[PDB]
Amino acid sequence: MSSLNNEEWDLLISGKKATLQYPIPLLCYPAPEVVSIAQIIDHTQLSLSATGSQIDVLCAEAKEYGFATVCVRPDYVSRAVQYLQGTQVGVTCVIGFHEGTYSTDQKVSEAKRAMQNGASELDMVMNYPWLSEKRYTDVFQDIRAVRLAAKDAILKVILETSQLTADEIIAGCVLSSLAGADYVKTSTGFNGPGASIENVSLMSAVCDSLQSETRVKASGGIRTIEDCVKMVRAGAERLGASAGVKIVNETRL
């Protein structure tokens, strides 16, 4: 993989596209058990204005409901880790967020600091403008550097699907998986529309065809229990949302 030039990456990716069934089959996977939906949600607060007290409330809600993780910015990782000691709730830190165009050196510095502060997972933003230009060796090296700086993390790579064609989404899934990512993720929620059943079904189809163990996270605009069910049917194994309290409350009636 590390040997390949941009033309060799282009040929490899075209070969993977050639194995897919078209039109892409939609909603292939079983429904989730709704009473236990909390166990697959990353409970999120990323507003610039969010205060320490608001982060404390996010952490209390995650301990109460049993969400998979809380998801926060670098400067709140230490606070969240302290709050959640003794529980089974992890901490996810965002990396190169939301723009994705931060240098590789900056992304690596952030990843190292987050792990030192006790994070268990990292959600990094891909340099998606390079992806569109077919600067494939640059995209690959950017992800590999973060992967090697944080060997023990669950690593998720955000594509920003609102800015990409289907051909570009295929390329992004292949490069992320072969670099060692644990997940590919749809959206930041800060630049255009979020998860669709079409994009999640395509991402799942690509990942399942590869030899690696890469899973799919649906994010952006997930507001109701109906939204959660449809994204899992499309192939998602984790969900990003801020509305998890209202969603679980629905299921208890």
Side-chain angles (χ1 to χ4, degrees), residues 2-210 212 214-253:
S2 49
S3 183
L4 305 187
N5 66 43
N6 288 335
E7 184 178 325
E8 296 174 314
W9 274 117
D10 193 53
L11 298 162
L12 187 151
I13 297 158
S14 282
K16 304 297 177 200
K17 179 180 179 186
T19 72
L20 304 176
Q21 174 71 30
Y22 283 94
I24 301 295
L26 304 182
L27 305 166
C28 289
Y29 299 84
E33 182 177 65
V34 296
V35 293
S36 311
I37 199 81
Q39 297 165 10
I40 67 169
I41 296 171
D42 289 347
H43 190 45
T44 306
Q45 173 62 275
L46 300 166
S47 299
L48 300 188
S49 69
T51 65
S53 292
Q54 285 178 288
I55 303 298
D56 292 344
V57 174
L58 186 81
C59 292
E61 290 168 342
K63 187 172 175 170
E64 169 193 350
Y65 281 90
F67 297 129
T69 71
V70 295
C71 177
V72 302
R73 290 187 183 253
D75 287 326
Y76 283 133
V77 173
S78 287
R79 187 179 191 118
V81 168
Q82 180 191 37
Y83 201 102
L84 297 162
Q85 293 279 1
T87 76
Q88 297 303 118
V89 182
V91 176
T92 301
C93 187
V94 294
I95 302 295
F97 192 93
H98 68 277
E99 296 91 338
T101 54
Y102 301 89
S103 71
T104 307
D105 292 324
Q106 292 165 101
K107 292 186 187 176
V108 168
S109 181
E110 285 190 333
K112 287 175 183 187
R113 179 181 170 230
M115 301 309 294
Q116 286 161 14
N117 283 332
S120 58
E121 318 198 359
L122 303 178
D123 287 19
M124 68 171 286
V125 186
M126 186 182 272
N127 199 320
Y128 58 88
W130 287 344
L131 187 74
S132 282
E133 298 171 39
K134 300 192 169 186
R135 283 170 71 162
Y136 291 146
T137 67
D138 288 324
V139 169
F140 187 78
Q141 288 169 26
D142 187 64
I143 300 163
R144 281 294 293 158
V146 173
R147 167 81 287 174
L148 296 168
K151 292 176 176 77
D152 294 327
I154 302 303
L155 177 64
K156 321 198 192 85
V157 178
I158 304 164
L159 307 184
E160 201 74 283
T161 55
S162 67
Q163 305 299 308
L164 304 177
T165 63
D167 285 337
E168 288 163 354
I169 294 167
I170 297 165
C173 290
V174 173
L175 293 156
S176 295
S177 183
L178 283 167
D182 302 290
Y183 282 83
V184 287
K185 171 174 166 186
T186 59
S187 315
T188 65
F190 282 71
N191 191 20
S196 68
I197 65 170
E198 294 81 4
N199 286 332
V200 175
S201 294
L202 172 66
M203 292 160 72
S204 289
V206 177
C207 288
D208 284 10
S209 78
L210 301 167
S212 332
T214 307
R215 295 174 165 86
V216 178
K217 175 173 172 187
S219 64
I222 301 174
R223 291 179 281 179
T224 69
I225 188 66
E226 291 92 349
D227 292 344
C228 295
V229 170
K230 81 186 186 192
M231 297 301 163
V232 169
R233 293 188 182 270
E237 291 176 77
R238 195 82 68 83
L239 304 168
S242 60
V245 173
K246 282 177 189 298
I247 293 161
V248 180
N249 284 349
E250 300 191 69
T251 73
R252 291 177 71 81
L253 304 179

